[PDB]
């Protein structure tokens, strides 16, 4: 999954400074949003949870998501393809 990880990534840093900061952080959350009412789950304190998860991803607290830290959460912990829809 490394490199679909990769992948994804890239598609969310616009700005490509290689960084997610936490205006991408929050697309990344709505999209996972719109994954969840399109599939009728209960999205009513799910953002919360989304924020915090995304929170704890960024290890060193940076106040962004770098693509390693990206990277080793979707592929140890996290997933962060499924919840995107992706897989
Ligand atoms: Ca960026
Ligand atoms: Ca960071």
Known sequence: PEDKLEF?????????????????????????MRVAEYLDWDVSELRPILQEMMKEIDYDGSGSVSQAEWVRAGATTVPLLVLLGLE
């Open 8 to 32: 994804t990534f890239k598609l969310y840093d616009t700005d490509r400074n290689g960084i997610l900061d936490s205006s991408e952080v929050d697309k990344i959350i709505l999209q996972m």
